[PDB]
From Swiss-Prot, chains A, B:
Binding-site residues, [Ni-4Fe-5S] cluster: H258, C292, C330, C443, C473, C523
Protein name, per record: Carbon monoxide dehydrogenase 2
Gene: cooS2
Domain of life: Bacteria
Family annotation (PANTHER family): CARBON MONOXIDE DEHYDROGENASE, HYDROXYLAMINE REDUCTASE
Family, similarity comment: Belongs to the Ni-containing carbon monoxide dehydrogenase family.
Source taxonomy: Bacteria, Bacillati, Bacillota, Clostridia, Thermoanaerobacterales
Domain remarks: Cluster B is an all-cysteinyl-liganded 4Fe-4S cluster; cluster C is a mixed Ni-Fe-S cluster which is the active site of CO oxidation. Cluster D is also an all-cysteinyl-liganded 4Fe-4S cluster that bridges the two subunits of the CODH dimer.
One GO-annotated biological process of the protein: response to hydrogen peroxide
Membrane topology designation: Peripheral membrane protein
Cofactor(s) named in the record: [4Fe-4S] cluster; [Ni-4Fe-5S] cluster
Binding site for [4Fe-4S] cluster 2: C45, C48, C53, C67
Keyword Thylakoid: no
Cofactor binding note: Binds 3 [4Fe-4S] clusters per homodimer.
Subunit (UniProt): Homodimer.
Length: 633, 633
């Protein structure tokens, strides 16, 4: 089972599923082999009904699409629709939060409120919305208004791009026409330009894709900003991760999907319902997180993380998961089928994301506390029905220190330098105690043994003194393998990095270091990494493409991860991807994305499936930047 | 060559291309056979990097997507992205026109103006924009404002849906949550819901697709409205079609693509440049149309139509096409490669639609007359370079009467009844002289011998007294085979229909009938058909799904045609498609789109690849509606 997952709790559940004849994501992958080579290389097009068209990677005909579309056009068009789809998901998320903030300050949804007043005012100030003399509810109205207005064309470009990147970066992107006009505007224009008989120049196509990736960044940043206003900016917290956080004698409820609008409320109400749960024979309600909405409540409330991404079905296989509460994105629809076997109540809550066979409970922000009790009451009923059944919760978990928003990282550093909090970080970059910064982001992928690329690359970078930060299921992978436990700093970290992590943790009075990897939050919270890196660029007076900062989507899966990787490249970072994206069928497109895009944005993709080799390449990219700043490396 | 195209001019050029070794769309189709069966049935998914996933239509594994996505989810998600892509193209078109109207009345683009004042005021009135006491430029500002606002969420739904359908239809659609909130909003929500681990219920998915098809209708209607304001509402015109409208001794310039913003200007300036052309040795500038922008200038200016859709390359093979001026959509990118062989100058003009190897000339509405002269001067240079070369223009053309906007049809009918212009049409429906109405729309497709389904079905309906109207390349197909020449009414039309066409043409004082098929314009001008049908519903006091009106996308190709077919079904029409859409891999999805959707919208798809059989089915659908209104049939 070690070939399927490096997670020991997951291996245990794989044996249980095998015993019980429950089919998993790894079984459905095996049954799909060998996979279509035209699709894996990107050489397939179904954009019109004359299709499908395919192109042999090598050999004889077919060599060209029926309408004349070349390999490089087919490959670029497919990549562009992937980016637009990713943009649409982060965008839908952010829009949901904007409507929620508006409803809240309109007296239309009392379960919600302005919790982070300081964040509200600073966002307002960055957007140019006057706060002086204004009611909080009115400033929030204006901020929600601004969020909604960035989805479409208007007199300004998308402000959740132009106001969050340093002016030098914005000017570089404007010079190539890459600043988005509107988030949903860019998505539609991509779908237009990639439809039949439209855009048919690889460079032109890919420039459109860079601009749409910045629409995805906007949606990520907007999501983070709005969730922080509504639910609070994260600060350091300690909790646990992996299947052992389930408790046989509790009502176990997974929150799964993406939007905290839902899960934050589940968390607060579940506390209101402890006695009801106790009456039904449970110790209480055990809320646990899966995928990004689980990261959101881990970051803000210390809710333990159960599992992530590719292994999400295994939480159900324990037999102890009473409910799985979903909103949207990255939920394997297999869970609805598996539920019949495992007794789990799968509940969908959003009108645009249903799963045949799951129970659907409309979630209205207006009725949030009421709807959440209805949902938790299904959970308690389910708990009562497994009275007497044996469960198999692997007794396996790790300790997780998390909650490192950019504000929290700045505050932590401020203990070493109150008026110039970034300076201590930059001092150690310069003296070599910190070689550079690597962001791990994105998914697990069934083609890669689960977490093997994230932990292999992270180990080699940490030994090399790289400051490692993580989000989404990259954070999931590293938390489940101990990388967020400060007790593993001695084992994992090079001396220089250890020194810095220890110097900062001591100064935050905890007699021990920060953890080996800093968990910066959900995948929209990749925007936090951007804020940090942009703050560093600004403090240094250089652009981002001169900083010794890289990203790694080491086991990428979702269209969203493709969108994130592309905007990492667009804002100037060397960006590793550890799964093959469908571009290998076109050497010209590959060459653009791994090399000449350096001349446009200064970032570039690093395609490398071998994790030790990837680590080497990421170190070389870091050290090259070090060299360009005139530092030793 | 009769197996490739039923057009004799196209057959002649196919022989020339074969002789000269120039590869065509039919050669690239042959080279693609046999085509992938997973893609043709819809059983393939590439929405994440764990893919590609496929599902055997029959047999053993694989039976399910790696994430658990079932055949019916994969099929519905693919269909939904097709609809969104179609919506995005009609939407981009309409947006282009809205910005153009705004620029114009802002003094920012003098080449453009309000030409149809009456249309401006009636649109303003239907939108609720006050006109009383207001300057035309201010009303136009407000109308452009309203157009732009329908792309996004706001206090009202999309008004180019809710104000163009009768209230009873809007209430039916609202009851199922099908009214779009915003055009680009719906496109992005589709891309979101169809991304991995999101919407996974076929019924839910397809309801989203119906709503996004109404966003496509909005964009079509908005495009028609805005192009009519700027360039004039069409009125009856006489011209010609097919390759014989090219003239060896003229500068032959094709306008190709979709937006009249461009082609209308090419038309007017080309007249300014006749002497320049005469100086270079040409008789003058011969502007001819291809695909929908060619329909637009045919409808408004009587510009002859050269060719359409699948056979567009053949205009170049004549050796006489000096320039092909493009904006976006449905242009085979092969034209850039073919140009090197044929001497044609291919010119792109829109930043989001370039073709490697073509010359690009930025077109700015602000500089429209200047840019258009630069472009025509490339044309004249090209003409001069084929001095002495032999050309092969097939001496083959048809006469085309066209320009039947809904306003023109109402005016024509008004000659038989001034204050109740629709009544004479309805009288003849009732007495049986008109069996019902069929709209032919959409593309040619290389899998079908060109035009064979459109003319076979049209012949059998016309004999049965059906009033046939047509748009886009369905209009192209029928015009090129004589169906828009009033001299063929005796041959083609049943006696009842002949009677009516003759009664109306005589009353419009022309001593002869209207043509056998009424050309209602480009594919956005399918909205004109909607206005007519809605006016008929309103005059009858019934909804559209009680009218004896059907649609046929008999040789569909583009995502746009899929979008149009789906909104035809959504507003209540029996809607034929004559090519297989990728839904056959899922019987539940097929059953929804061909049968239970009747219970939701009253319309339904009719999938039939055999044209005689299709005609039978369309007649049965018409006669069933006749029966439901209590009429004989
Ligand atoms: S767009 Fe071109 S390459 Fe794609 S399916 Fe249609 S004919 Fe084939
Ligand atoms: S979304 Fe599901 S069915 Fe589609 S490629 Fe990914 S794993 Fe396969
Ligand atoms: S030919 Fe397999 S993905 Fe299309
Ligand atoms: S397997 Fe051929 S279209 Fe994907």
């Amino acid at each position: 089972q070690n070939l399927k997952s490096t997670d020991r709790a997951v291996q245990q559940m794989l044996d249980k599923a095998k015993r019980e004849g429950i089919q998993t994501v790894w079984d459905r992958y095996e049954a799909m082999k060998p996979q279509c080579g035209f699709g894996e290389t990107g050489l397939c097009c179904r954009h019109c009904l004359q299709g499908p068209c395919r192109i042999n990677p090598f050999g004889d005909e077919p060599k060209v699409g029926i309408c004349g579309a070349t390999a490089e056009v087919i490959v670029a068009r497919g990549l562009d629709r992937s980016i637009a789809a990713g943009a649409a998901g982060h965008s839908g998320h952010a829009k949901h939060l904007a409507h929620t903030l508006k409803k809240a300050v309109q007296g239309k949804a009392a379960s919600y409120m302005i919790k982070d007043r300081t964040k509200l005012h600073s966002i307002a100030k960055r957007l140019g919305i006057p706060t002086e003399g204004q009611k909080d509810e009115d400033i929030a109205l204006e901020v929600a208004k601004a969020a909604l207005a960035d989805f479409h064309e208007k007199d300004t470009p998308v402000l959740w791009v132009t106001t969050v990147l340093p002016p030098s970066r914005v000017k570089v992107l404007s010079a190539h026409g890459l600043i988005p006009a509107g988030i949903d505007h860019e998505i539609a224009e991509i779908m237009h330009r990639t439809s039949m008989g439209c855009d048919a120049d690889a460079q032109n196509l890919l420039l459109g894709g860079l601009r749409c990736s910045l629409a995805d960044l906007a949606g990520c940043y907007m999501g983070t900003d709005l969730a922080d206003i509504l639910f609070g900016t994260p600060a350091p917290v300690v909790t646990e991760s992996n299947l052992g956080v389930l408790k046989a004698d509790a009502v176990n409820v997974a929150v799964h999907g993406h939007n905290p609008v839902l899960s934050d409320i589940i968390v607060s109400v579940s506390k209101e319902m402890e006695n009801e749960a106790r009456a039904a024979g449970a110790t209480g309600i055990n809320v646990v997180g899966i995928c990004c909405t689980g990261n959101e409540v881990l970051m803000r409330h210390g809710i333990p993380a159960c599992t992530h991404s590719v292994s999400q079905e295994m939480a159900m296989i324990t037999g102890a998961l009473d409910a799985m509460i979903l909103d949207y994105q990255c939920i394997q629809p297999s869970v609805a089928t598996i539920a019949e076997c495992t007794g789990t109540t799968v509940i969908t809550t959003m009108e645009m994301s249903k799963i045949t066979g799951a129970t659907h409970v409309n979630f209205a922000e207006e009725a949030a506390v009421e709807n959440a009790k209805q949902i938790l009451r299904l959970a308690i009923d389910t708990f009562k029905r497994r009275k007497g059944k044996p469960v198999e919760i692997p007794n396996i978990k790790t300790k997780v220190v998390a909650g490192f928003s950019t504000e929290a990282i700045i505050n932590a550093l401020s203990k070493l330098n109150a008026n110039d909090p970034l300076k201590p970080l930059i001092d150690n970059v310069v003296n070599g105690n910190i070689r550079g910064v690597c962001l791990f982001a994105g998914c697990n992928n069934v083609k890669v043994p689960q977490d093997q690329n994230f932990t292999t690359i992270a180990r080699k970078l940490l030994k090399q003194n790289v400051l490692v930060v993580a989000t989404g299921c990259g954070a999931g992978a590293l938390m489940r393998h101990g990388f967020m436990d400060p007790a593993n700093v001695d084992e994992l970290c090079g001396d220089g990095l250890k020194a810095v992590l220890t110097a900062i943790g001591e100064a935050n009075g905890l007699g021990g270091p920060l953890p080996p990897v800093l968990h910066m939050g959900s995948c929209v919270d990749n925007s936090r990494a951007v804020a940090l890196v942009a703050a560093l660029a600004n403090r240094l007076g250089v652009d981002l493409d001169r900083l010794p900062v890289v990203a790694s989507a080491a086991e990428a899966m979702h269209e969203k991860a493709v969108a994130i990787g592309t905007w990492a490249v667009t804002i100037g970072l060397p960006t590793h991807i550890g799964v093959l994206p469908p571009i290998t069928g076109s050497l010209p497109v590959t060459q653009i994305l791994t090399s000449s895009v350096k001349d446009i944005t200064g970032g570039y993709f690093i395609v490398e499936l071998d994790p030790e080799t990837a680590a080497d390449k990421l170190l070389a990219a870091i050290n090259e930047r070090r060299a360009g700043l005139g530092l030793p490396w």
